[PDB]
Design a protein around this ligand. Structure first.
Ligand code: HEM
Length: 153
């Protein structure tokens, strides 16, 4: 359970991300695909991309980064009361997209890295710890839905 002070740190940096949702979404997906190439293989939509320059040039990838970050921002702004938002996301990611929880840990690392690069003054260690707690809570709740459905592993 995050404290109110922890949530304020999370949402303070997130309000900065929202100034350039698409730039952040590109940086995060590119970091994820470069750091963990098994993740790119889950996207029939993107698996033709073979270089970072091709990734940066793809408008469709930039569009999907906005989709992703808009869904994450709506979950963070619920401050833990996010059951309605996680149901469809866990369902699609477990049963249609076939995304292991571990890959959610990988995109969490990529989000934290990109927030640290772009917002260092609002992403000191206190805010890094709070964002890690928020993303851990996200993963915990999704993993419980995966387990229900027979996909936790
Ligand atoms: C912060 C974590 C994530 C969020 C908020 C998120 C959100 C979304 C949303 C909103 C969609 C479109 C609606 C839907 O299908 O449910 C989507 C699609 C998808 N996501 Fe995620 N996602 C996350 C992580 C991941 C990861 C880590 C992977 C793969 C390693 C992944 C793979 C996919 C795939 C394959 C699609 C379908 C893309 C397409 O062909 O249109 N997602 N995601």
């Amino acid at each position: 359970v995050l404290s109110e002070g922890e949530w304020q740190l999370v949402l303070h940096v997130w309000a900065k991300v929202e100034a350039d949702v698409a730039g952040h979404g590109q940086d995060i997906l590119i970091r994820l695909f470069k750091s963990h190439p098994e993740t790119l293989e889950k996207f029939d939509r993107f698996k033709h991309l073979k270089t970072e320059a091709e990734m940066k040039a793809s408008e469709d990838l930039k569009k999907h980064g906005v989709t992703v970050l808009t869904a994450l921002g709506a979950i963070l702004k619920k401050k833990g009361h996010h059951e309605a938002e996680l149901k469809p996301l866990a369902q699609s990611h477990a049963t249609k997209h076939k995304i292991p929880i571990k890959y959610l840990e990988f995109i969490s690392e990529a989000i934290i890295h990109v927030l640290h690069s772009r917002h260092p003054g609002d992403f000191g260690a206190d805010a890094q710890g709070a964002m890690n707690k928020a993303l851990e809570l996200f993963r915990k709740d999704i993993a419980a839905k995966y387990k229900e459905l027979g996909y936790q592993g």
